[PDB]
A paper describes a structure:
Apart from its native function, myoglobin is remarkably versatile as a catalyst for carbene transfer reactions8−12 and additionally exhibits promiscuous peroxidase activity13−15—two reaction types that are mechanistically related to nitrene transfer. Here, we investigated the reduction of azides by the model heme protein myoglobin to gain mechanistic insights into the factors that control the fate of key reaction intermediates.
Analogous experiments were carried out with GlyOEt rather than Az-1 as a control. Following anaerobic reduction of Mb* crystals and addition of GlyOEt, crystals were captured with a loop, cryoprotected, cryo-cooled, and diffraction data were collected. Although the protein backbones of Mb*Int and Mb*GlyOEt closely align with a root-mean-square deviation (rmsd) of 0.115 Å, the differences observed at the active site unambiguously demonstrate that the two structures are distinct. The broad shoulder on the Soret band clearly indicates a mixture of unliganded ferrous Mb* and the GlyOEt complex, suggesting that the product binds the reduced heme cofactor only weakly.
Author numbering: 0 to 154
Write the structure that this text describes.
Amino acid sequence: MVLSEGEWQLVLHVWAKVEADVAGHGQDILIRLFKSHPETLEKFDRFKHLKTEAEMKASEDLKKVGVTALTALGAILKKKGHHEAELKPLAQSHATKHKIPIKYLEFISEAIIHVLHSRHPGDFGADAQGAMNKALELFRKDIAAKYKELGYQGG
Ligand code: HEM
């Protein structure tokens, strides 16, 4: 399934650690994204009054958005590449409604790997990082193809 079975197992092993605290992981990933690439914050209209990390962590709205997003990503990862039916609506909303370039999906992928390694280093070594990188690369490639199918280059 594009990745090897062993690679998918490493992806899902670390994902199980994410699932012990989806809300906290989602908050940390978003905060890391906004800190590393501040232009991404402009895409979230309801979060622009959040000026500090503590304000972001206190926002129930932001926490809920993060949980919804990681839940969708987890459902995609669990399909081990067989994710067309789950990925198509996500592509539609992110291309046409939120207007998210593929580069921003690279930025959030970086943030995901950063948070996963920060929290779970003993379960996220080099081989697991490589597997997760391949899984997110596949996600980004397939969503870029769906963007094009909808008439969006995603640049
Ligand atoms: C792993 C990558 C991502 C996943 C799995 C994901 C998933 C989701 C899901 C499931 C939703 C709720 C339904 C929807 O509107 O589609 C959502 C909302 C949204 N996403 Fe993403 N997303 C990702 C990346 C991004 C990035 C990188 C940005 C911006 C830099 C972004 C911006 C937004 C915005 C603005 C919303 C609307 C939130 C709201 O108003 O409630 N997404 N995302």
